Design a protein around this ligand. Structure first.
Ligand code: NAD
Ligand code: NAD
Ligand code: CA
Ligand code: CA
Lengths: 250, 250
């Protein structure tokens, strides 16, 4: 009942952290329109959530396209009448040294991570202002450190955090809060990275003070629920570290 | 519901933010031993909480006294059998320019804020280890900026945040998380500061993006509940800004 009566939009909601956000949000009483290009995982998640009596709607959409932001907003409004929560979770990237980077690498990272964050916030702003709602964007601890091979990934992530701080200041008068989560969780995207960079991945796992890679449902999603809920109604423009204590903000 | 079955120690728990934490903790199902020198407010709070069906115990103690840590730990165990949560909330200080600072100003700030935080963490460590518990310490945004007149207040606050990060690293293997809240709330200590420094207080009020000074119960305490609860079980060593967006950690 933490999000009872609230409507949430979750991008990349068919897998990884976005799937766990969708599951826990519905479990907390929220109506969720979750968006993904993966309709195999997307339709089965819709089937599982609606079977248990939850209100979830899958929308198959590539959020990197110009018309996706308005289609996502229109689909949430048509299905649930409003938008209280916007979780900009989806992001794709490629890892390579800076001297190895290509324009396609920046296009992927900014096109799937940064610009959908901006465009969905612009499209959903009237609905979020009506709801006095909450926007949860996603950063990364490796973008804070400057982890090697993360040129295009970290550039988009820190651009996401920058616009999150600007929007927090611009939208605070409307009662809309904007915050960032930096997670570390066992997802499909992390498993592919652990296979391509096993030494770096093992060093990252061994660094976690709490001695585990996060579970998306029990370690990451409750932090997103907190930011989407009225418990954080006096918190905006912040970055929450859901990483087992790996990086401590000062 | 959220802290059902948990025992909490809350210092300065009879007034201001500490009282809001004590109230809200009991509403979430926790058993609270709250400590304060204000026995008038302390006795009435205990009467109010037990009268509403809650479990709370008031301990009258000056936490700057060197035996109070063991007296507090023993009282919590004697009343409720263990310690799952430690909230180091009490802190008294005086404001003056650096060129106007006396040793008694440093003694008050360190003696009421910093050293009780260390000693209560040491005293409660066996109970927190048994519980795999959570420690919530308190900082200040004014210490982050270095606001004038805050030499002794900021020094103790940043010393608190330092030991919080050290213990988070040292205690993470035991499953004990340690985090900091930086609040901005309408309390009696803030009211006394508003009278002594009206222009600076007006400037601090006007800076808040969310355009209000925090209500202790609805704006500050739910952030403490989040850190004390299992929703933040993957978060340690962090600082949470409950300040309406005034300061954004990067
Ligand atoms: N998992 C981690 O440890 C970790 C670490 C740092 C940051 N993050 C951030 O957390 C968020 C979640 O990451 P994850 O590991 O769950 O990702 P993932 O790669 O495991 O899953 C991403 C999901 O988003 C969907 N998606 C990708 N591109 C899309 C597009 N253009 N349109 C619609 N849907 C699309 C995919 O189908 C997939 O379901 C990401 O923004 C990521 O940058 C995660
Ligand atoms: N209220 C704010 O805006 C604000 C801003 C920055 C930081 N903080 C921090 O938040 C915490 C709460 O502050 P507040 O505004 O509620 O303070 P306050 O002065 O309003 O309340 C302090 C409470 O602690 C008790 N106390 C003080 N010294 C004690 C001692 N030696 N032993 C036992 N009890 C003692 C007092 O009796 C009182 O009940 C403090 O640590 C403060 O530094 C608050
Ligand atoms: Ca876009
Ligand atoms: Ca002491």
């Amino acid at each position: 009942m933490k999000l009872r009566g609230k409507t949430a939009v979750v991008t990349g909601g068919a897998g990884g952290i976005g799937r766990a956000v969708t599951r826990v949000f519905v479990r907390e009483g929220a109506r969720v329109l979750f968006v993904d290009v993966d309709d195999d995982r997307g339709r089965a998640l819709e089937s599982e959530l609606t079977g248990a009596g939850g209100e979830a709607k899958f929308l198959q959409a590539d959020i990197s396209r110009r018309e996706s932001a308005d289609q996502i907003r229109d689909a949430a409004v048509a299905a649930f009448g409003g938008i209280d929560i916007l979780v900009n979770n989806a992001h794709a990237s490629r890892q390579a040294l800076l001297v190895e980077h290509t324009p396609e690498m920046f296009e992927l990272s900014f096109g799937t991570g940064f610009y959908p964050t901006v465009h969905l916030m612009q499209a959903c702003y009237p609905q979020l202002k009506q709801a006095r709602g909450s926007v949860v964007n996603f950063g990364s601890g490796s973008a804070l450190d400057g982890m090697p091979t993360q040129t295009s990934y970290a550039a988009a992530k820190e651009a996401i955090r920058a616009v999150s701080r600007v929007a927090a200041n611009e939208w605070a008068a409307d009662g809309i809060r904007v915050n960032v989560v930096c997670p570390f969780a066992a997802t499909e995207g992390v498993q592919a990275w652990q296979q391509a960079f096993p030494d770096r991945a093992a060093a990252a796992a061994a660094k976690v003070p709490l001695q585990r890679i996060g579970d998306p449902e029990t370690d990451i999603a409750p932090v997103v629920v907190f930011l989407a809920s009225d418990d954080s109604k006096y918190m905006t423009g912040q970055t929450l570290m859901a990483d087992g204590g790996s990086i401590k903000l000062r």
